Every structure is written in C-alpha cells, then in structure tokens.
Amino acid sequence: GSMHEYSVVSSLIALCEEHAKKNQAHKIERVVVGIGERSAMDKSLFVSAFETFREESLVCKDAILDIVDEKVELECKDCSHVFKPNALDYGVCEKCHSKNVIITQGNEMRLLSLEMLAE
Numbered sequence: 001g002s003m004h005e006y007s008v009v010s011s012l013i014a015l016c017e018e019h020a021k022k023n024q025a026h027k028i029e030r031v032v033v034g035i036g037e038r039s040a041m042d043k044s045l046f047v048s049a050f051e052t053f054r055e056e057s058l059v060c061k062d063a064i065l066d067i068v069d070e071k072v073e074l075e076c077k078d079c080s081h082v083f084k085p086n087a088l089d090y091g092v093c094e095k096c097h098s099k100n101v102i103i104t105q106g107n108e109m110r111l112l113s114l115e116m117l118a119e
C-alpha cells in the first residue's frame with residue numbers, strides 16, 4: 001500500500017524544523033492542532049505518530065502536540081448562509097429551502113498554531 005498515515009506526520013515535523021531555522025530559534029515549545037469531531041480519527045494515534053518521527057530532527061524533540069476537539073459546521077453551496085447540524089426532516093437551509101449543504105468544518109483536520117522557547 002501507501003504510507004498516507006505518515007504524510008501528515010512527516011509534513012508537520014519538517015515544517016517545525018523549517019520554521020525553527022528561519023526564525024533562528026533552533027527549538028520548539030508546543031504545536032496546536034484542530035481535529036473535527038466527525039473526522040473519526042484517533043487523536044492518540046496521530047500524536048503517537050508525531051512523537052515517533054520527532055527524532056528525525058534535533059530541534060523537534062523538545063516539543064508537545066496539543067489536540068483541540070473541533071466542532072461541525074454546514075455551509076450552503078450557491079447561497080450566503082452557514083449553520084450547525086441539528087434538524088433532519090426540516091433540515092433545509094434557512095435562506096433557501098433545499099438540503100444541498102456541505103461540511104465546511106468537522107470532517108477535516110488542520111494545524112491551528114505553533115510555539116517556540118527562546119531559552
């Protein structure tokens with residue numbers, strides 16, 4: 001198969017290393033991530049992979065990864081409105097009476113911010 005489960009991992013750790021040389025920090029303190037509550041991904045599995053590959057780079061080993069549990073949000077296609085998943089039978093858009101809405105937040109993870117220690 002393919003190591004797609006380590007793509008996100010390798011990417012983030014490389015980004016940490018590339019920021020720390022550019023800011024001339026040569027360390028990290030924290031990283032902060034947002035995992036949507038409908039992505040069904042194990043936060044424990046993702047961090048355990050990040051902590052495993054951490055050893056690739058000396059600046060990376062002094063860090064911790066903080067997972068924010070993120071909410072779900074429903075956007076409308078050709079419209080101008082956004083709401084929370086609640087109704088079903090009458091679960092149409094508030095402006096336009098159709099169920100054409102999509103998940104803009106809740107299915108997908110992203111990085112939120114990073115931190116570095118000067119000392």
Ligand SMILES: [Zn+2]
Nearest residue numbers: 076079093096
């Ligand atoms: Zn709409």
